[PDB]
Amino acid sequence: SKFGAISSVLNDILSRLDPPEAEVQIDRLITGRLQSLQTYVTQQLIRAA
Amino acid sequence: LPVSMTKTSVDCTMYICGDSTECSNLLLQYGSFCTQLKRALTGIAVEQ
Amino acid sequence: LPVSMTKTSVDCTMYICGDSTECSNLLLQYGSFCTQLKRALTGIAVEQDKNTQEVFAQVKQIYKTPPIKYFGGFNFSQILPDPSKPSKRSPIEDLLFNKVTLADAGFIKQYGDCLGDIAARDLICAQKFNGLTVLPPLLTDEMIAQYTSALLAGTITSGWTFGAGPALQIPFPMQMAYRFNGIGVTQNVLYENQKLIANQFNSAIGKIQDSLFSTPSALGKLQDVVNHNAQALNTLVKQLSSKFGAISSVLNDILSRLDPPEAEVQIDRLITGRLQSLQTYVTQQLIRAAEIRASANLAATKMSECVLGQSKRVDFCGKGYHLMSFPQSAPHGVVFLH
Amino acid sequence: SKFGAISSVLNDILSRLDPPEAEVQIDRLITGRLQSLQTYVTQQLIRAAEIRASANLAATKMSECVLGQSKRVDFCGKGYHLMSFPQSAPHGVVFLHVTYVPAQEKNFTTAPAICHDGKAHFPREGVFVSNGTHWFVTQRNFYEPQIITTDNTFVSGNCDVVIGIVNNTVYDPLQLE
Amino acid sequence: VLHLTQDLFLPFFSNVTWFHAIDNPVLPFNDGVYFASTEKSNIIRGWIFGTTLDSKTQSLLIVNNATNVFIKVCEFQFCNDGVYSSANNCTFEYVSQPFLMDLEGKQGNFKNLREFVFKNIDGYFKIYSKHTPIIGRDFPQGFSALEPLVDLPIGINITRFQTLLALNRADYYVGYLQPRTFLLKYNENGTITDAVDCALDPLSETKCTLKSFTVEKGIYQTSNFRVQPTESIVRFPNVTNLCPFHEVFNATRFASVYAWNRTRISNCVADYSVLYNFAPFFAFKCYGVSPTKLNDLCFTNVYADSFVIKGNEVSQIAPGQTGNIADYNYKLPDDFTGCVIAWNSNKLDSKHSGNYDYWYRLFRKSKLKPFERDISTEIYQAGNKPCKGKGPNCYFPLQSYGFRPTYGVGHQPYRVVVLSFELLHAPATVCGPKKSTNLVKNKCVNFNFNGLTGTGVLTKSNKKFLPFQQFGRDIVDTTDAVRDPQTLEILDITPCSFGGVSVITPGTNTSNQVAVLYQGVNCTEVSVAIHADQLTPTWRVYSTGSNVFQTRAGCLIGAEYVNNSYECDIPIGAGICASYQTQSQSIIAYTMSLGAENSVAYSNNSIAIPTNFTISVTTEI
Amino acid sequence: VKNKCVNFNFNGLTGTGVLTKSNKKFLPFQQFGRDIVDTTDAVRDPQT
Amino acid sequence: VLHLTQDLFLPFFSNVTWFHAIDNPVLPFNDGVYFASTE
């Protein structure tokens, strides 16, 4: 899921953009994936309980 | 009656940054947001 | 069995925006997103209090042991309170309080000595510096021992009658005989080996205290709960040093370095990071509080069955044919003597 | 809540701005509302798990207290449980535990066994109780004194190992006939 | 509905200044003004606003007459009594219905109470009015809603306020609004029946947290209390040396970009007014720091790289940029935290007949990594020749920034100096000009130790700071101890009386009295703070001496400790419960009564057996 | 067009829904309408 | 406190080349060098 960035492939967007701005799309992907993993861990904790 | 679920041990570093050093650097700025996750999954596996 | 956890009342405005008017104004733009957090933490505190009440306040009348202590040869002086000790707590109980160390007592009013800390301020002063306090439980560790003693005196002097209605006195050998009759063994066998069973009971009382002493950690569950709460609080406070992808991680120097309509972006980034971390903490506390609620309901049922009577369900009140169970208060939990 | 955007209304921002930046504000509204909705769903999951625990408790309570007599003390209300009656309530159930609670009691006396002739007599079921002058056998939760008899008691012992034994005479319905 | 709003309101039980009229002082205007007046028929016409009330700043006039109003935005001169003498830059007139309604029931018993509220948020002047047939009291107390009348876009800096009178041959009540949070009870018809301020009393504030007009019996966590620093101490370097910025800008031979002259700024006080002075500024793009608030920062090391360069390369210089200069001559680091400065210099880098002194590199074997100088004369290779010389296929690396007093804008000799800061945790040597105040210990106080802004209580310490040590911290990484720059002593850092306020009250349908808790703080600190009026909460609960009880769960104010024992009614914590008990009624606090004290008659041969029984039907839900 | 699903752009307040007559008690200054959750509930007709 | 840091630190049980004197070789400099001497 692009999460509102240029692309969903990290290896692609590092080689296609220079750090200064890339950083923005990488942060967008970071906050997307990390929130998805947070939802997963919360649901897994619920299921485990 | 269910007794246990599958024990999963996902890792933030790869799952969010596939072997990317600059992405690891960026993730480090989010604090210990993923040590908590590894602890939670490990505790879940131990609890199972 | 754990009965309760440390009650927390983390506050949004101070935790996220340390006394910063612009930061609080921009936090108001997220709505009551965190009034939910305060409500959830208040609910957790009330639920923990109700858990302690359910576990322990199972008798309306506080009974007292007879001034003399001769229960047919049975030696109990390890579980009734000791008058000499100021805390009025049994020797079995004292080991429990001495083998559990609380990171944050809460009932300390530690304000005033963070200046007197001299050395580096500790975890509690650090938490007070960023708005995460610990409320103390409604029932103190002293009157909780009074409730435990009341339950204990109800069992050894009135059998299981006091768990149903009025407390009817009955000799302890006779209660032993009736519990024996409850597991399919004639009461007579006890009345010919009362001396032997009394000696075995005394020996087991003495050995179990030593077993709970020389052990590294037989209180692993209670210490695990305390460690979990302390570790959650530490992870909560540690995210305040995380830049979250901004220029710096401190509101005070961020406002003092950038003018309002450019510092807005950085402050919003901090708000997004800190609210997400706080939501993580609150959800994990909710989950652990539900787990502790289940454990405390199990403890309350175990008390109401094993303590206030004999339970026929095998392997519920410890291994083997159940006879009695003597409760003992523990830091944020209860310990049974089946 | 604006969540950090120009406005909190989608039909406002869309009809007032052009995509370039705009999308930015709509993405901000997305990351606000989705996170709020996720908070709601997580709280609902917590509450529904707690309600499931309470519902399993209620189901076991029904199956035990209503469909039978439960020997576990304090489970089906306070006191010696007799029966329960369920009643429907909005989003829940209401139980009417009927419990047997004792009443007025009196100090009498008691002894673990009665030694008639070198042999200790123990109560088959009940309590060896003494008015104060004439020993009696009775129940456990209700006073009903009965004349001590060889059927009301079982004999096994030697009158020398049981502490607290008392001297009394037990009767037999066989010698008379 | 019980809708809650945050807007400028007149605080409940605030103070209105009552005047008379028999000369007409000017009243300050700030965040809006509440106005009220009780007059028989008419003695007040209108109001005038603006600043300095002269013919230099736009002003206002809200005068009324029998049939209309006279709203206008003008620059009147004066009247000193036809209420103006100037209409020069006076447009935006307005005429509508009059603001004053007066009705009589064949008697002058009606002083026609006239409530008015004005404010100037983002211009858009708002006027609210409501006329209540006067009752016995001039400014009584019953609730009266206030309705808007007009809202038109004024857009002038309203600071002063004045009133107009009438002619003839106890009114004027004026109040000021400040921003508060209000909860309003809306009637079924849509009107307003009751409102409660969330900054008045504990019961009111709780009422504003349980969003309702009935606070039922119980204890409610509402907010937090925080002591406010009575003072504000700043401690900055013992030296007051002005930085050599002047010499950096008063230079005559600013080196070219290919060899960027890098100066060092250390052990000095950076006052950037001198930076502004020697600068016909054209490009002051600051990135890591807002340029305005540059004198309130402490930097460890300051770098001033100076080079004269063309016009468009001024736009070229920025972090994460590119170009013939940005790639091979001068690359700023992406994470640049500083300012770049460009001002035109055609008077020192130009002369008749030409000047080809300056240089720049278009030919480098690779990119220039950030903050690197590549002074070198090597001919760039093309193809595969080891050629060493000038001409085709053998190119000399650096070309000329030829300058003569005649170019276009983008091609003139712009003068560029960049300032690079190091804003991290370190002992700073460069700070802004500030007055190092004294030191006050054992008192909550905002501190600015060497640029580390915060608030808390300072004191002496017995720490063992090593000579290089400057800061303090804990496993949580928060500043704990800061060494005094001008006394070289260790001072700890503490929270400014952080806690949590919980209000114990019975149901408002029973009583209005309340008991306040300050969580996990000794009352001795809140007692002195209250007596010093430095507490964040504004609601000051009464302290009669008998209402103070240091609990283990905090400390209680407003409830008297009763040594008796009763069943818990409202749990406070640590075995203390408060309840509303008769004396004739008040709030008391007491210890838990876990139950009736009972003793069993256990004995060797004594038994209790019931001779009777009862059938009890309980309920479980 | 009342009692019918319609796109409305009332005095700059755009939305979707069904409109009809009401028996509100709007005060003369009142222009919009809302609920406890501040959802636009009633709109005064500017030309009626 | 048990603070954890990430910086240029000499690895434990790493290689340290020991020299003598009685000509003064130039040594490479990279990510800093650790220097020690007893005299």
Ligand SMILES: *[C@@H]1O[C@H](CO)[C@@H](O[C@@H]2O[C@H](CO)[C@@H](O)[C@H](O)[C@@H]2O)[C@H](O)[C@H]1NC(C)=O
């Ligand atoms: C019941 O058990 C108690 C265990 O604490 C006995 O106390 C003991 O007292 C002796 C001295 O007489 C100590 O040496 C020993 O360490 C222990 O504290 C108590 O005597 C005993 N009483 C009976 C009647 O069995």
Ligand SMILES: *[C@@H]1O[C@H](CO)[C@@H](O[C@@H]2O[C@H](CO)[C@@H](O)[C@H](O)[C@@H]2O)[C@H](O)[C@H]1NC(C)=O
């Ligand atoms: C012992 O229990 C006896 C029950 O049989 C009680 O004796 C009764 O006494 C009456 C005369 O007072 C007799 O008529 C009756 O047949 C019975 O024997 C007796 O009260 C009781 N003792 C005490 C002290 O209560």
Ligand SMILES: *[C@@H]1O[C@H](CO)[C@@H](O[C@@H]2O[C@H](CO)[C@@H](O)[C@H](O)[C@@H]2O)[C@H](O)[C@H]1NC(C)=O
């Ligand atoms: C119960 O009655 C027994 C005889 O009927 C008693 O035994 C007697 O004990 C005495 C010594 O106590 C002997 O001297 C005598 O020969 C006979 O064995 C017994 O003591 C008595 N017990 C009680 C408690 O009354």
Ligand SMILES: *[C@@H]1O[C@H](CO)[C@@H](O[C@@H]2O[C@H](CO)[C@@H](O)[C@H](O)[C@@H]2O)[C@H](O)[C@H]1NC(C)=O
């Ligand atoms: C850049 O040019 C500056 C102006 O000449 C130099 O700064 C000063 O140079 C004078 C020369 O007399 C010194 O007296 C003074 O102390 C100061 O250094 C600066 O050194 C120079 N820097 C580079 C890297 O060329």
Ligand SMILES: *[C@@H]1O[C@H](CO)[C@@H](O[C@@H]2O[C@H](CO)[C@@H](O)[C@H](O)[C@@H]2O)[C@H](O)[C@H]1NC(C)=O
């Ligand atoms: C056991 O307890 C019953 C009630 O708890 C008693 O019943 C009472 O009888 C009296 C008349 O004697 C009534 O007035 C009263 O309303 C109630 O029904 C019952 O008598 C009692 N029995 C004994 C033996 O104590």
Ligand SMILES: *[C@@H]1O[C@H](CO)[C@@H](O)[C@H](O)[C@H]1NC(C)=O
């Ligand atoms: C039994 O006697 C004791 C001693 O007086 C007394 O305290 C107790 O209440 C009595 N129990 C009864 C009469 O049921």
Ligand SMILES: *[C@@H]1O[C@H](CO)[C@@H](O)[C@H](O)[C@H]1NC(C)=O
């Ligand atoms: C009030 O002033 C207006 C503006 O000049 C005028 O039209 C109107 O007649 C006046 N009303 C009076 C004098 O009653």
Ligand SMILES: *[C@@H]1O[C@H](CO)[C@@H](O)[C@H](O)[C@H]1NC(C)=O
């Ligand atoms: C009148 O004043 C306004 C407000 O400053 C100003 O914009 C306008 O130019 C002025 N009109 C003149 C000077 O003619």
Ligand SMILES: *[C@@H]1O[C@H](CO)[C@@H](O)[C@H](O)[C@H]1NC(C)=O
């Ligand atoms: C005065 O009001 C005008 C209206 O826009 C505004 O431009 C100006 O900034 C205000 N004055 C000040 C000092 O802000």
Ligand SMILES: *[C@@H]1O[C@H](CO)[C@@H](O)[C@H](O)[C@H]1NC(C)=O
């Ligand atoms: C150089 O110094 C003189 C001396 O007063 C001053 O007038 C001039 O503005 C300075 N120029 C610069 C560029 O600083």
Ligand SMILES: *[C@@H]1O[C@H](CO)[C@@H](O)[C@H](O)[C@H]1NC(C)=O
């Ligand atoms: C600061 O300067 C003053 C005056 O020169 C001096 O008396 C004082 O000792 C200095 N303090 C330190 C810490 O250098």
Ligand SMILES: *[C@@H]1O[C@H](CO)[C@@H](O)[C@H](O)[C@H]1NC(C)=O
């Ligand atoms: C809190 O309790 C009292 C009253 O203030 C006083 O000893 C001191 O302020 C505090 N005590 C401790 C041990 O911190």
Ligand SMILES: *[C@@H]1O[C@H](CO)[C@@H](O)[C@H](O)[C@H]1NC(C)=O
């Ligand atoms: C009554 O209360 C006071 C303190 O308010 C206490 O010192 C005293 O001991 C109490 N008296 C009794 C009999 O408890």
Ligand SMILES: *[C@@H]1O[C@H](CO)[C@@H](O)[C@H](O)[C@H]1NC(C)=O
């Ligand atoms: C019970 O018996 C023991 C041992 O004979 C004696 O010490 C105690 O005082 C007796 N108690 C009563 C109430 O008779």
Ligand SMILES: *[C@@H]1O[C@H](CO)[C@@H](O)[C@H](O)[C@H]1NC(C)=O
């Ligand atoms: C709107 O204006 C028209 C044109 O004059 C008029 O016929 C109609 O009555 C007006 N309605 C309202 C509500 O103002």
Ligand SMILES: *[C@@H]1O[C@H](CO)[C@@H](O)[C@H](O)[C@H]1NC(C)=O
């Ligand atoms: C250090 O150098 C020696 C000699 O080359 C080598 O044998 C040794 O393995 C080195 N140390 C380590 C840890 O490899």
